[PDB]
Amino acid sequence: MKRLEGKSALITGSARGIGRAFAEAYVREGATVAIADIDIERARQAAAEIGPAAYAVQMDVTRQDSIDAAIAATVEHAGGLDILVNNAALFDLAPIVEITRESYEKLFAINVAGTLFTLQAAARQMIAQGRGGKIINMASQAGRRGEALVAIYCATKAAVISLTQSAGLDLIKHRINVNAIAPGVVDGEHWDGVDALFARYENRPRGEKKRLVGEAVPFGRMGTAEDLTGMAIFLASAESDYIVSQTYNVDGGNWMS
Amino acid sequence: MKRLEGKSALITGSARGIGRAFAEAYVREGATVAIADIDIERARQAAAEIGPAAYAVQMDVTRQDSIDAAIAATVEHAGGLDILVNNAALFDLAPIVEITRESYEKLFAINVAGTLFTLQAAARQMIAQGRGGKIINMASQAGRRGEALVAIYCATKAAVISLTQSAGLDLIKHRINVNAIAPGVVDGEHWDGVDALFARYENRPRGEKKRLVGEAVPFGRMGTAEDLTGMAIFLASAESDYIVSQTYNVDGGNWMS
Amino acid sequence: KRLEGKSALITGSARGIGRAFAEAYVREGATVAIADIDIERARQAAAEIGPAAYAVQMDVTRQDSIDAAIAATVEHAGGLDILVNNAALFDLAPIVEITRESYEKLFAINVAGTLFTLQAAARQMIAQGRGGKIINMASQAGRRGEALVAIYCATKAAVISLTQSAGLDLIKHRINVNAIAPGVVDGEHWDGVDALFARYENRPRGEKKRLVGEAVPFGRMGTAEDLTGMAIFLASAESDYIVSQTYNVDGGNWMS
Amino acid sequence: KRLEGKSALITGSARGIGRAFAEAYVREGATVAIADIDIERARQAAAEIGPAAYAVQMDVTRQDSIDAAIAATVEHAGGLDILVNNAALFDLAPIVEITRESYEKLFAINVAGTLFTLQAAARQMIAQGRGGKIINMASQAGRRGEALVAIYCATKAAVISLTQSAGLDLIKHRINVNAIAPGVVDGEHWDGVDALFARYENRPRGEKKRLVGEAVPFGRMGTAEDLTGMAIFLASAESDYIVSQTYNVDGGNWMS
Ligand SMILES: OC[C@@H](O)[C@@H](O)[C@H](O)[C@@H](O)CO
Ligand SMILES: OC[C@@H](O)[C@@H](O)[C@H](O)[C@@H](O)CO
Ligand SMILES: OC[C@@H](O)[C@@H](O)[C@H](O)[C@@H](O)CO
Ligand SMILES: OC[C@@H](O)[C@@H](O)[C@H](O)[C@@H](O)CO
């Protein structure tokens, strides 16, 4: 297809799961992809498995110096930055009266501050190049509507949707598209962990939550990262140039926006 | 690219404007396209200009017998129906105290009933075939939020978003995706009419509303049909198979959903 | 009290939520036209509520009936201050079994009935020059679609849209247009809802009613008395700055 | 009247909307903690409002301050029945000029402030076993993003989210969690808003205020008094079935 031919992308948290499937689909479409992760060991493996057009970048989105160095590493390696995917995220679950300041601080630091300050750094580079840009934030059904036990993670994803809108309005004058994707329930490592938290607080065998949520998807199954790669390419591609400040649910019907 | 290779499409209201641009893009992507319009003269012209893979069908979405004969024509000519685009619509504007029963009956008959009952006829054919299906309703910024002067057209597109959600949840068991596109302000014959209506009721020179509205788009310009064709292909394509009951704004940031 | 000396009309207020609203308005000092297509049931409702209530035959699907009800409100009460568009009809059916009969029946009363009654009440409130309160009945069903409930969800989605458009156009005349979206409310309406779901989801009668009442975050099926606070609030001076809103009163069933 | 014998705490209630809420709650028979980082301004507001109002020094960004403020409410009034999370901070800046300082400042007060005061009040209401009312202050800014207001929009979007999550999780304790979304409201707050826009949009001081007031469908900038109705309603028995909602009180500025 080669919809992203000769673009330079960076994907946060892309050593594994959705981010890694995005990095693989972007390379197939002709992009050069910085596989950015706090796990540089795993990012190096993913990059070697994907091919020459992927390369590994150590990044902690909670740290300005680390954000700024991955953008620099992208510029130094790929000549610049065309596509940012804000994919780095942390999940946690607790009822209101058991939420910790540590839970709040760590999920806001990566899900909100990590997304905003990486977007800022990417937009400054895209503006300095003068060629436009594509920024794709990762939201979630969790950001469409609250849940009794997931206040913190829901709020971070609600903040990401709002940030997507703000930044898209502020950056479209530079021909930077900011938009977001809102997955449903996606099978993998991520949803294994989610399931363990619900197992504890809803008093359920390990694996039952993840079975039930997958069966309640109107489409009829839990998501895969491959359900999402179409939209990831589309929102990075010329065919989305008029799309601004949107969150698109790709969730088998889990949330209707 | 040929992402709709060997597919059979029908687009209501496609002799001109957005639907004609969709029929043109679908053909480029390998589709066979029923150019359905109440205006057979213009459909025939549009099909001749697009090429052999387009073919004209006389249709009034307000009439059951016409709906069912357009679906049959599609099966007779293309062997079946894979993609419906519900594009046929009617625009009107009047303050609350000036809305006529005639404005309401005619815009609900085309924009709502035409959409629902064509969707119904296409869903039955797609179920009969057993191969799944793609249905794309045309909503509007006007369906996201009301306007003092556009209560009827706004309500119809609000009903389309709702219908899109309902039909999506009901039809996805048959592997029929129902989604919608929500354009912003799009340049052409359509918006010339809109402008004439505002000119009268906001007491403005012809062309001033079109100017102002195109200049208030955060993207920075009035839409084109070409802005939309990417989304039209995508939502008809295998890369949108997990997308269900969504309305996607392609509007240069005019409305943020 | 809070509606002292105000003239209301409620469409479809012989029975259920509409009737709870008429009674609650009369307790707050309002005169209320109990507008219903069944004049027998309206008359009973009016006798039970007391002298401040009166019965008005009305078919919100007929222009002539609309204009005659508004006129009858003017004749009896001197004018119209509050309209509640409560008249509605429920139906259910999968996409492939939806009939033009259902579509035309639910649209004529839930949408056209709301719109043209609102138009008539607007015209009257504009001519009086004293402003006004209009309250459309939306539903959780207007907030999101449902596989089986396409037609009824669409009508209530259109009511939320209309409520927005009308509130924007009419606020210059000091007329507030807003809507209430109930969730799952116990009564003769949800007896009918349950019966349809019983057929289409293969359930014993009463099970849907039970399941949805228990899924309400608050912990039960709603009552009309849950809604009276808001219907008073939105027709009162304490909501003068409130324009073009739909407010969910639904135990958390839908979060807007 | 409607809040007779209830104990309220309002964060950041020495001045503006919070202070109008305090006075309106005392008029409706409430005892009110005027909680504010500025104890001198709180003392003045308390003295002006009358004996039912008392001042509490409170930094909603500090856990110890939050807990001591809840404890001062229990000591002074005997319990806590109504929290209003009103304390908030405005800032404006384009994406490329957002500081970590702004992000950290606005989230600490607008989000963490709201969340951990809500948690502290929840714990106290649960231990009491008598239910309660929590009202978060959202904003039109919470409803949609703006080019120059990413941080403040994001905080109020998180307040809407938190309001939904908290309301769902606390309704079993008969605690209602709801929010109010003002639009553009006149006062010291919008003075500061206008000053920031004057810089970034290159406008004379006061112009932004003028433009936004005039673009409210209703026809003017809002007052605190536009909001007291709803603040009372959401703390009252006639909102007991109202759960996890954000209600716009904004003259039509934003339609939800
Ligand atoms: O990725 C987050 C996950 O999808 C989850 O938060 C769901 O919203 C919810 O927690 C239960 O189904
Ligand atoms: O095609 C619909 C059209 O975009 C128009 O209705 C705008 O919503 C509005 O009328 C004001 O610009
Ligand atoms: O008054 C409408 C009613 O509450 C219903 O349509 C529900 O939305 C749903 O159909 C089943 O729970
Ligand atoms: O207090 C929030 C305020 O109303 C402001 O943020 C407006 O939303 C907007 O920023 C300018 O009109």
PDB file of all heavy atoms in Angstrom, chain C residues 2 218 220 222 238 241 245-248 251 254 256, chain D residues 2 218 220 222 238 240-241 245-248 251 254 256:
ATOM      1  N   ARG C   2     -43.685  27.470  44.100  1.00  0.00           N
ATOM      2  CA  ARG C   2     -42.637  27.884  43.118  1.00  0.00           C
ATOM      3  C   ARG C   2     -43.214  28.151  41.725  1.00  0.00           C
ATOM      4  O   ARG C   2     -42.505  28.765  40.927  1.00  0.00           O
ATOM      5  CB  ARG C   2     -41.535  26.823  43.011  1.00  0.00           C
ATOM      6  CG  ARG C   2     -40.705  26.671  44.278  1.00  0.00           C
ATOM      7  CD  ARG C   2     -39.756  25.497  44.222  1.00  0.00           C
ATOM      8  NE  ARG C   2     -40.407  24.279  44.636  1.00  0.00           N
ATOM      9  CZ  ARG C   2     -39.846  23.081  44.677  1.00  0.00           C
ATOM     10  NH1 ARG C   2     -38.584  22.897  44.317  1.00  0.00           N
ATOM     11  NH2 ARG C   2     -40.565  22.054  45.074  1.00  0.00           N
ATOM     12  N   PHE C 218     -28.223   3.536  40.957  1.00  0.00           N
ATOM     13  CA  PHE C 218     -28.986   3.920  42.171  1.00  0.00           C
ATOM     14  C   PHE C 218     -29.573   2.694  42.864  1.00  0.00           C
ATOM     15  O   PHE C 218     -29.705   2.736  44.055  1.00  0.00           O
ATOM     16  CB  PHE C 218     -30.121   4.869  41.825  1.00  0.00           C
ATOM     17  CG  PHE C 218     -30.886   5.386  43.015  1.00  0.00           C
ATOM     18  CD1 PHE C 218     -30.555   6.576  43.622  1.00  0.00           C
ATOM     19  CD2 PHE C 218     -31.929   4.632  43.567  1.00  0.00           C
ATOM     20  CE1 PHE C 218     -31.261   7.013  44.735  1.00  0.00           C
ATOM     21  CE2 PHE C 218     -32.633   5.059  44.692  1.00  0.00           C
ATOM     22  CZ  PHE C 218     -32.301   6.252  45.263  1.00  0.00           C
ATOM     23  N   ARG C 220     -32.664   0.844  41.943  1.00  0.00           N
ATOM     24  CA  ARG C 220     -34.037   0.432  41.579  1.00  0.00           C
ATOM     25  C   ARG C 220     -34.504   1.165  40.323  1.00  0.00           C
ATOM     26  O   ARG C 220     -33.953   2.279  39.973  1.00  0.00           O
ATOM     27  CB  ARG C 220     -35.000   0.759  42.732  1.00  0.00           C
ATOM     28  CG  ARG C 220     -35.086   2.240  43.056  1.00  0.00           C
ATOM     29  CD  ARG C 220     -36.367   2.643  43.743  1.00  0.00           C
ATOM     30  NE  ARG C 220     -36.239   3.971  44.274  1.00  0.00           N
ATOM     31  CZ  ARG C 220     -36.441   5.098  43.590  1.00  0.00           C
ATOM     32  NH1 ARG C 220     -36.818   5.082  42.327  1.00  0.00           N
ATOM     33  NH2 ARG C 220     -36.275   6.263  44.185  1.00  0.00           N
ATOM     34  N   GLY C 222     -37.045   3.517  38.311  1.00  0.00           N
ATOM     35  CA  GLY C 222     -37.480   4.859  38.697  1.00  0.00           C
ATOM     36  C   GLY C 222     -38.956   4.934  38.986  1.00  0.00           C
ATOM     37  O   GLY C 222     -39.764   4.047  38.551  1.00  0.00           O
ATOM     38  N   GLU C 238     -35.551  29.563  39.229  1.00  0.00           N
ATOM     39  CA  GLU C 238     -34.218  29.045  39.590  1.00  0.00           C
ATOM     40  C   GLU C 238     -33.541  28.426  38.350  1.00  0.00           C
ATOM     41  O   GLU C 238     -32.350  28.186  38.417  1.00  0.00           O
ATOM     42  CB  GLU C 238     -34.404  28.082  40.752  1.00  0.00           C
ATOM     43  CG  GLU C 238     -34.696  28.851  42.044  1.00  0.00           C
ATOM     44  CD  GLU C 238     -34.581  27.965  43.255  1.00  0.00           C
ATOM     45  OE1 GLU C 238     -35.057  26.823  43.185  1.00  0.00           O
ATOM     46  OE2 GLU C 238     -33.963  28.377  44.222  1.00  0.00           O
ATOM     47  N   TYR C 241     -31.448  30.802  33.668  1.00  0.00           N
ATOM     48  CA  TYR C 241     -30.233  30.815  32.819  1.00  0.00           C
ATOM     49  C   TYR C 241     -30.012  29.459  32.146  1.00  0.00           C
ATOM     50  O   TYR C 241     -28.895  29.288  31.608  1.00  0.00           O
ATOM     51  CB  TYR C 241     -28.987  31.123  33.632  1.00  0.00           C
ATOM     52  CG  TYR C 241     -27.841  31.731  32.892  1.00  0.00           C
ATOM     53  CD1 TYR C 241     -27.998  32.907  32.157  1.00  0.00           C
ATOM     54  CD2 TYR C 241     -26.567  31.179  32.999  1.00  0.00           C
ATOM     55  CE1 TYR C 241     -26.907  33.472  31.497  1.00  0.00           C
ATOM     56  CE2 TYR C 241     -25.489  31.712  32.304  1.00  0.00           C
ATOM     57  CZ  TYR C 241     -25.662  32.867  31.561  1.00  0.00           C
ATOM     58  OH  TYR C 241     -24.583  33.430  30.951  1.00  0.00           O
ATOM     59  N   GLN C 245     -30.777  22.459  27.364  1.00  0.00           N
ATOM     60  CA  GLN C 245     -30.143  21.253  27.992  1.00  0.00           C
ATOM     61  C   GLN C 245     -31.051  20.041  27.947  1.00  0.00           C
ATOM     62  O   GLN C 245     -32.222  20.218  28.055  1.00  0.00           O
ATOM     63  CB  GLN C 245     -29.693  21.496  29.425  1.00  0.00           C
ATOM     64  CG  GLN C 245     -28.793  22.720  29.594  1.00  0.00           C
ATOM     65  CD  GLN C 245     -27.543  22.719  28.742  1.00  0.00           C
ATOM     66  OE1 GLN C 245     -26.958  21.673  28.538  1.00  0.00           O
ATOM     67  NE2 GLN C 245     -27.132  23.876  28.225  1.00  0.00           N
ATOM     68  N   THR C 246     -30.492  18.828  27.835  1.00  0.00           N
ATOM     69  CA  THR C 246     -31.206  17.621  28.315  1.00  0.00           C
ATOM     70  C   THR C 246     -30.561  17.171  29.634  1.00  0.00           C
ATOM     71  O   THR C 246     -29.364  16.920  29.667  1.00  0.00           O
ATOM     72  CB  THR C 246     -31.233  16.523  27.251  1.00  0.00           C
ATOM     73  OG1 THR C 246     -31.916  17.068  26.119  1.00  0.00           O
ATOM     74  CG2 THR C 246     -31.932  15.267  27.741  1.00  0.00           C
ATOM     75  N   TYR C 247     -31.356  17.041  30.690  1.00  0.00           N
ATOM     76  CA  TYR C 247     -30.861  16.593  31.998  1.00  0.00           C
ATOM     77  C   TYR C 247     -31.365  15.163  32.225  1.00  0.00           C
ATOM     78  O   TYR C 247     -32.653  14.992  32.356  1.00  0.00           O
ATOM     79  CB  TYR C 247     -31.370  17.590  33.053  1.00  0.00           C
ATOM     80  CG  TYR C 247     -30.742  18.966  33.101  1.00  0.00           C
ATOM     81  CD1 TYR C 247     -31.241  19.906  34.009  1.00  0.00           C
ATOM     82  CD2 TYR C 247     -29.562  19.276  32.448  1.00  0.00           C
ATOM     83  CE1 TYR C 247     -30.629  21.139  34.194  1.00  0.00           C
ATOM     84  CE2 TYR C 247     -28.929  20.494  32.641  1.00  0.00           C
ATOM     85  CZ  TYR C 247     -29.497  21.445  33.486  1.00  0.00           C
ATOM     86  OH  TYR C 247     -28.938  22.657  33.695  1.00  0.00           O
ATOM     87  N   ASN C 248     -30.428  14.201  32.309  1.00  0.00           N
ATOM     88  CA  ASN C 248     -30.672  12.829  32.822  1.00  0.00           C
ATOM     89  C   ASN C 248     -31.032  12.787  34.314  1.00  0.00           C
ATOM     90  O   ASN C 248     -30.227  13.230  35.213  1.00  0.00           O
ATOM     91  CB  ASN C 248     -29.516  11.912  32.586  1.00  0.00           C
ATOM     92  CG  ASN C 248     -29.079  11.936  31.142  1.00  0.00           C
ATOM     93  OD1 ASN C 248     -29.749  12.544  30.320  1.00  0.00           O
ATOM     94  ND2 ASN C 248     -28.035  11.168  30.880  1.00  0.00           N
ATOM     95  N   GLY C 251     -30.999   7.727  37.890  1.00  0.00           N
ATOM     96  CA  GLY C 251     -30.256   6.860  38.827  1.00  0.00           C
ATOM     97  C   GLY C 251     -28.855   6.499  38.323  1.00  0.00           C
ATOM     98  O   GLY C 251     -28.305   5.546  38.879  1.00  0.00           O
ATOM     99  N   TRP C 254     -27.480   6.655  32.532  1.00  0.00           N
ATOM    100  CA  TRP C 254     -26.781   7.281  31.383  1.00  0.00           C
ATOM    101  C   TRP C 254     -26.160   8.576  31.875  1.00  0.00           C
ATOM    102  O   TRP C 254     -26.800   9.302  32.676  1.00  0.00           O
ATOM    103  CB  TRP C 254     -27.676   7.517  30.175  1.00  0.00           C
ATOM    104  CG  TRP C 254     -26.787   7.628  28.977  1.00  0.00           C
ATOM    105  CD1 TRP C 254     -26.318   8.776  28.423  1.00  0.00           C
ATOM    106  CD2 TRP C 254     -26.128   6.542  28.298  1.00  0.00           C
ATOM    107  NE1 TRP C 254     -25.473   8.473  27.386  1.00  0.00           N
ATOM    108  CE2 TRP C 254     -25.301   7.111  27.315  1.00  0.00           C
ATOM    109  CE3 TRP C 254     -26.146   5.153  28.420  1.00  0.00           C
ATOM    110  CZ2 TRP C 254     -24.505   6.329  26.456  1.00  0.00           C
ATOM    111  CZ3 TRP C 254     -25.369   4.383  27.572  1.00  0.00           C
ATOM    112  CH2 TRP C 254     -24.579   4.959  26.588  1.00  0.00           C
ATOM    113  N   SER C 256     -24.606  12.022  31.212  1.00  0.00           N
ATOM    114  CA  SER C 256     -24.415  13.190  30.310  1.00  0.00           C
ATOM    115  C   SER C 256     -24.000  14.422  31.114  1.00  0.00           C
ATOM    116  O   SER C 256     -23.808  14.349  32.397  1.00  0.00           O
ATOM    117  CB  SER C 256     -25.653  13.444  29.499  1.00  0.00           C
ATOM    118  OG  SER C 256     -26.055  12.268  28.802  1.00  0.00           O
TER     119      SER C 256
ATOM    120  N   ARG D   2     -34.837  24.356  52.234  1.00  0.00           N
ATOM    121  CA  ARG D   2     -34.616  23.058  51.529  1.00  0.00           C
ATOM    122  C   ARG D   2     -33.402  22.281  52.060  1.00  0.00           C
ATOM    123  O   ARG D   2     -33.301  21.113  51.707  1.00  0.00           O
ATOM    124  CB  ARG D   2     -34.451  23.329  50.035  1.00  0.00           C
ATOM    125  CG  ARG D   2     -35.737  23.812  49.383  1.00  0.00           C
ATOM    126  CD  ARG D   2     -35.580  24.131  47.914  1.00  0.00           C
ATOM    127  NE  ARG D   2     -35.192  25.516  47.789  1.00  0.00           N
ATOM    128  CZ  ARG D   2     -34.960  26.122  46.653  1.00  0.00           C
ATOM    129  NH1 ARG D   2     -35.107  25.470  45.506  1.00  0.00           N
ATOM    130  NH2 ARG D   2     -34.580  27.380  46.665  1.00  0.00           N
ATOM    131  N   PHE D 218     -28.582  33.102  25.673  1.00  0.00           N
ATOM    132  CA  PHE D 218     -29.386  33.854  26.680  1.00  0.00           C
ATOM    133  C   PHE D 218     -29.231  35.370  26.545  1.00  0.00           C
ATOM    134  O   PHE D 218     -30.199  36.046  26.774  1.00  0.00           O
ATOM    135  CB  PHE D 218     -28.990  33.476  28.087  1.00  0.00           C
ATOM    136  CG  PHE D 218     -29.863  34.070  29.160  1.00  0.00           C
ATOM    137  CD1 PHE D 218     -30.959  33.404  29.638  1.00  0.00           C
ATOM    138  CD2 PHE D 218     -29.546  35.302  29.723  1.00  0.00           C
ATOM    139  CE1 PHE D 218     -31.726  33.965  30.651  1.00  0.00           C
ATOM    140  CE2 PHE D 218     -30.352  35.901  30.684  1.00  0.00           C
ATOM    141  CZ  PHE D 218     -31.416  35.203  31.178  1.00  0.00           C
ATOM    142  N   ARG D 220     -26.360  37.427  27.903  1.00  0.00           N
ATOM    143  CA  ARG D 220     -25.359  38.086  28.778  1.00  0.00           C
ATOM    144  C   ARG D 220     -24.445  37.055  29.444  1.00  0.00           C
ATOM    145  O   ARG D 220     -24.823  35.848  29.571  1.00  0.00           O
ATOM    146  CB  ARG D 220     -26.073  38.922  29.849  1.00  0.00           C
ATOM    147  CG  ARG D 220     -26.934  38.117  30.806  1.00  0.00           C
ATOM    148  CD  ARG D 220     -27.274  38.824  32.128  1.00  0.00           C
ATOM    149  NE  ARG D 220     -28.297  38.082  32.845  1.00  0.00           N
ATOM    150  CZ  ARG D 220     -28.082  36.953  33.560  1.00  0.00           C
ATOM    151  NH1 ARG D 220     -26.882  36.408  33.665  1.00  0.00           N
ATOM    152  NH2 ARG D 220     -29.077  36.353  34.180  1.00  0.00           N
ATOM    153  N   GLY D 222     -22.865  35.334  32.693  1.00  0.00           N
ATOM    154  CA  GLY D 222     -23.582  34.731  33.814  1.00  0.00           C
ATOM    155  C   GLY D 222     -23.200  35.397  35.105  1.00  0.00           C
ATOM    156  O   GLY D 222     -22.091  35.978  35.225  1.00  0.00           O
ATOM    157  N   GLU D 238     -35.019  16.563  46.185  1.00  0.00           N
ATOM    158  CA  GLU D 238     -35.646  16.464  44.847  1.00  0.00           C
ATOM    159  C   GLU D 238     -34.592  16.092  43.791  1.00  0.00           C
ATOM    160  O   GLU D 238     -34.965  15.945  42.610  1.00  0.00           O
ATOM    161  CB  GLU D 238     -36.263  17.803  44.490  1.00  0.00           C
ATOM    162  CG  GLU D 238     -37.282  18.325  45.507  1.00  0.00           C
ATOM    163  CD  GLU D 238     -38.012  19.520  44.914  1.00  0.00           C
ATOM    164  OE1 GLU D 238     -37.333  20.543  44.569  1.00  0.00           O
ATOM    165  OE2 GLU D 238     -39.221  19.378  44.683  1.00  0.00           O
ATOM    166  N   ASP D 240     -32.562  13.276  44.635  1.00  0.00           N
ATOM    167  CA  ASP D 240     -32.015  11.994  45.171  1.00  0.00           C
ATOM    168  C   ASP D 240     -31.813  10.968  44.045  1.00  0.00           C
ATOM    169  O   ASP D 240     -30.956  10.107  44.223  1.00  0.00           O
ATOM    170  CB  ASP D 240     -32.887  11.388  46.248  1.00  0.00           C
ATOM    171  CG  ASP D 240     -32.800  12.155  47.561  1.00  0.00           C
ATOM    172  OD1 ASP D 240     -31.857  12.955  47.774  1.00  0.00           O
ATOM    173  OD2 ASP D 240     -33.701  11.996  48.345  1.00  0.00           O
ATOM    174  N   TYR D 241     -32.592  10.962  42.959  1.00  0.00           N
ATOM    175  CA  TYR D 241     -32.400   9.917  41.911  1.00  0.00           C
ATOM    176  C   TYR D 241     -31.358  10.382  40.878  1.00  0.00           C
ATOM    177  O   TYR D 241     -31.245   9.709  39.839  1.00  0.00           O
ATOM    178  CB  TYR D 241     -33.712   9.618  41.189  1.00  0.00           C
ATOM    179  CG  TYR D 241     -33.808   8.279  40.513  1.00  0.00           C
ATOM    180  CD1 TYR D 241     -33.581   7.100  41.216  1.00  0.00           C
ATOM    181  CD2 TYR D 241     -34.160   8.186  39.167  1.00  0.00           C
ATOM    182  CE1 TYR D 241     -33.701   5.866  40.579  1.00  0.00           C
ATOM    183  CE2 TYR D 241     -34.221   6.948  38.515  1.00  0.00           C
ATOM    184  CZ  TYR D 241     -33.983   5.789  39.222  1.00  0.00           C
ATOM    185  OH  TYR D 241     -34.120   4.585  38.586  1.00  0.00           O
ATOM    186  N   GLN D 245     -24.238  12.939  36.908  1.00  0.00           N
ATOM    187  CA  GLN D 245     -24.548  13.895  35.801  1.00  0.00           C
ATOM    188  C   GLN D 245     -23.714  15.152  35.948  1.00  0.00           C
ATOM    189  O   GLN D 245     -23.504  15.569  37.116  1.00  0.00           O
ATOM    190  CB  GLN D 245     -26.008  14.358  35.752  1.00  0.00           C
ATOM    191  CG  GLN D 245     -27.013  13.234  35.708  1.00  0.00           C
ATOM    192  CD  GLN D 245     -26.725  12.265  34.605  1.00  0.00           C
ATOM    193  OE1 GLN D 245     -26.437  12.707  33.518  1.00  0.00           O
ATOM    194  NE2 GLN D 245     -26.780  10.956  34.875  1.00  0.00           N
ATOM    195  N   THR D 246     -23.313  15.747  34.800  1.00  0.00           N
ATOM    196  CA  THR D 246     -22.876  17.164  34.728  1.00  0.00           C
ATOM    197  C   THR D 246     -24.002  17.971  34.086  1.00  0.00           C
ATOM    198  O   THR D 246     -24.396  17.669  32.940  1.00  0.00           O
ATOM    199  CB  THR D 246     -21.546  17.310  33.988  1.00  0.00           C
ATOM    200  OG1 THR D 246     -20.593  16.572  34.737  1.00  0.00           O
ATOM    201  CG2 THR D 246     -21.100  18.754  33.866  1.00  0.00           C
ATOM    202  N   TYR D 247     -24.496  18.969  34.786  1.00  0.00           N
ATOM    203  CA  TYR D 247     -25.574  19.835  34.258  1.00  0.00           C
ATOM    204  C   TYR D 247     -24.962  21.199  33.899  1.00  0.00           C
ATOM    205  O   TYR D 247     -24.439  21.896  34.856  1.00  0.00           O
ATOM    206  CB  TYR D 247     -26.651  19.988  35.332  1.00  0.00           C
ATOM    207  CG  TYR D 247     -27.527  18.791  35.623  1.00  0.00           C
ATOM    208  CD1 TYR D 247     -28.402  18.797  36.713  1.00  0.00           C
ATOM    209  CD2 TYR D 247     -27.614  17.739  34.729  1.00  0.00           C
ATOM    210  CE1 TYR D 247     -29.270  17.742  36.940  1.00  0.00           C
ATOM    211  CE2 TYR D 247     -28.475  16.675  34.952  1.00  0.00           C
ATOM    212  CZ  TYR D 247     -29.298  16.679  36.060  1.00  0.00           C
ATOM    213  OH  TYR D 247     -30.165  15.643  36.215  1.00  0.00           O
ATOM    214  N   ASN D 248     -25.081  21.597  32.628  1.00  0.00           N
ATOM    215  CA  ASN D 248     -24.762  22.963  32.147  1.00  0.00           C
ATOM    216  C   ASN D 248     -25.838  23.974  32.576  1.00  0.00           C
ATOM    217  O   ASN D 248     -27.067  23.852  32.197  1.00  0.00           O
ATOM    218  CB  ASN D 248     -24.595  23.024  30.654  1.00  0.00           C
ATOM    219  CG  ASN D 248     -23.660  21.949  30.122  1.00  0.00           C
ATOM    220  OD1 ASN D 248     -22.959  21.327  30.905  1.00  0.00           O
ATOM    221  ND2 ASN D 248     -23.630  21.798  28.809  1.00  0.00           N
ATOM    222  N   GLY D 251     -26.597  29.587  30.027  1.00  0.00           N
ATOM    223  CA  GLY D 251     -27.376  30.342  29.032  1.00  0.00           C
ATOM    224  C   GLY D 251     -27.308  29.739  27.637  1.00  0.00           C
ATOM    225  O   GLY D 251     -27.596  30.527  26.670  1.00  0.00           O
ATOM    226  N   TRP D 254     -23.205  25.816  25.977  1.00  0.00           N
ATOM    227  CA  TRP D 254     -22.844  24.438  25.625  1.00  0.00           C
ATOM    228  C   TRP D 254     -24.072  23.576  25.896  1.00  0.00           C
ATOM    229  O   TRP D 254     -24.795  23.759  26.897  1.00  0.00           O
ATOM    230  CB  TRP D 254     -21.589  23.921  26.347  1.00  0.00           C
ATOM    231  CG  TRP D 254     -21.047  22.756  25.557  1.00  0.00           C
ATOM    232  CD1 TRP D 254     -21.230  21.416  25.765  1.00  0.00           C
ATOM    233  CD2 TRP D 254     -20.380  22.870  24.293  1.00  0.00           C
ATOM    234  NE1 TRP D 254     -20.612  20.687  24.764  1.00  0.00           N
ATOM    235  CE2 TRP D 254     -20.110  21.565  23.840  1.00  0.00           C
ATOM    236  CE3 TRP D 254     -19.925  23.960  23.543  1.00  0.00           C
ATOM    237  CZ2 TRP D 254     -19.433  21.330  22.629  1.00  0.00           C
ATOM    238  CZ3 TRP D 254     -19.236  23.729  22.367  1.00  0.00           C
ATOM    239  CH2 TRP D 254     -18.991  22.431  21.922  1.00  0.00           C
ATOM    240  N   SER D 256     -25.594  19.999  26.427  1.00  0.00           N
ATOM    241  CA  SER D 256     -25.347  18.574  26.804  1.00  0.00           C
ATOM    242  C   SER D 256     -26.651  17.907  27.242  1.00  0.00           C
ATOM    243  O   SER D 256     -27.783  18.483  27.184  1.00  0.00           O
ATOM    244  CB  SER D 256     -24.297  18.459  27.882  1.00  0.00           C
ATOM    245  OG  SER D 256     -23.113  19.126  27.544  1.00  0.00           O
TER     246      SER D 256
END
